[PDB]
Antibody
């Protein structure tokens, strides 16, 4: 079973965006499909639900009249049309499902309720008038003083980008041991920055090559930065 | 007719092997229509418990749920390092009606104290072309999260020109790492020689300083 959200991105206040939730591996017609969002640093908030078999819908008061949830059972796909967007709509949007039925009854006993067993990975919607800016990637070079067989650290500084997110890998994903990619920080300038570091054997410097692979999809940017000891 | 789910505590720190109980009070009857989810930062929530007390397939048996009237509990019988997460309750009593969530409980794994390993990085020549210099100090694999980083430039204490970021707790060893970035103009950077970060952490016998000389 899978759910995959798409359509998120940067949008100006007052603008509109259509999110899609492509379903696979279960009876989409009988399910209930929900949109649940998470604003940065905040909790989960339900937005809307639909029962694809009947077309019935429901909405949170915060979005009634501005958002429309819909479904196409011919394509097993649900949609969230978001209009009149506000900064408070900035969030990761998840699609999730209930298997039918929502609630069942066991005679002479109680009710039994479904829950959200499958969720998508989420798609980020950023409501802002600020413009997209690609990152600059700088080496965090290993020290010359990492002597005689201890541990050295190296990394990459990913500076001055907007909107989120950036992802970082090392050696195209082949290096994960000792990797720490820090949460992005919003700088006072309004642009984000983050760093990614890795620890390696001091002996490995000079014989090994380390590449940080930085992806900023909002600017269609892919940077592969070799991080070397400075000569 | 909004149903409020009041979750407590909002945060807790507990050791491996401890019994942890999280409570959720509904503001009106929600029958047994309560689910519990576990969410790791940046990942979708995962279902643990449905219909107040049913354990979802594949979830370890250390998780259990109970209902008493409008009070719901999630218990982790023996906390494990991988259980660091934010946990949420959620009610669904109203058919095709509003779904409401608790505010979340952030569970941290308490472990023994571990001092950071410290590293300092100068700005790159590439960055200096742009007129700004970023100096970075890394504190690696420490516990607890509290730490103090003091930047010194030619032995003069800096203030107001640095920003910190901390990783989420490691799912295996329960440690944190931290970066501090000092941002200066290139011109100011070129006016000074010794760049140092001094780290205070309870796992260290005394503060640790790492430094470099510009050039």
């Amino acid at each position: 079973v899978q759910l995959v959200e798409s359509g998120g991105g940067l949008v100006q206040p007052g603008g509109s965006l259509r999110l899609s939730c492509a379903a696979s591996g279960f009876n989409f017609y009988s399910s209930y499909i929900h949109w649940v969002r998470q604003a940065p640093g905040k909790g989960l908030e339900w937005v809307a639900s639909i029962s694809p078999y009947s077309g019935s819908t429901s909405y949170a008061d915060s979005v009634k009249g501005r958002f429309t949830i819909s479904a196409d059972t011919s394509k097993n796909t649900a949609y969230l049309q978001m209009n009149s967007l506000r900064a408070e709509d900035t969030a990761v949007y998840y699609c999730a499902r209930y298997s039918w039925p929502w609630v069942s009854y066991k005679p002479y006993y109680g009710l039994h309720f479904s829950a959200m067993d499958y969720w998508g990975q989420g798609t980020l919607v950023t409501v802002s008038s600020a413009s997209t800016k690609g990152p600059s990637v700088f080496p965090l070079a290993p020290s010359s003083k990492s002597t005689s067989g201890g541990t050295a650290a190296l990394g990459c500084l990913v500076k001055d980008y907007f909107p989120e997110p950036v992802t970082v890998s090392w050696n195209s994903g082949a290096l994960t041991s000792g990797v720490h990619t820090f949460p992005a920080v919003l700088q006072s300038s309004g642009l984000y920055s983050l760093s990614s570091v890795v620890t390696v054997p001091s002996s490995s410097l000079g014989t090994q090559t380390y590449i940080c692979n930085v992806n900023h999809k909002p600017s269609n940017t892919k940077v592969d930065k070799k991080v070397e000891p400075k000569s | 007719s909004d149903i409020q789910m009041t979750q407590s505590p909002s945060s807790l720190s507990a050791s491996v092997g401890d019994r942890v109980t999280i409570t959720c009070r509904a503001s009106q009857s929600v029958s047994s229509a309560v689910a519990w989810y576990q969410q790791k930062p940046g990942k979708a929530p995962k279902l643990l418990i449905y219909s107040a007390s049913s354990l979802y397939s594949g979830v370890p048996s250390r998780f259990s749920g109970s209902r008493s009237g409008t009070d719901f509990t999630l218990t982790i019988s023996s906390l494990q390092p991988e259980d660091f997460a934010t946990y949420y309750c959620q009610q669904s009593v109203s058919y095709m009606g509003p779904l409401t969530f608790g505010q979340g409980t952030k569970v941290e794994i308490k472990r023994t104290v571990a001092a950071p390993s410290v590293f300092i990085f100068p700005p790159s020549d590439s960055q200096l072309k742009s007129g700004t210099a970023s100096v970075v100090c890394l504190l690696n694999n420490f516990y607890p999260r509290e730490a103090k980083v003091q930047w010194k430039v030619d032995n003069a204490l800096q203030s107001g020109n640095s920003q910190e970021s901390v990783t989420e707790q490691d799912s295996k060893d329960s440690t944190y790492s931290l970066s501090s970035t000092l941002t200066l103009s290139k011109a100011d950077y070129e006016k000074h020689k010794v760049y140092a970060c001094e780290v205070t952490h309870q796992g260290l016998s005394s503060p640790v300083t790492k430094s470099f000389n510009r050039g």
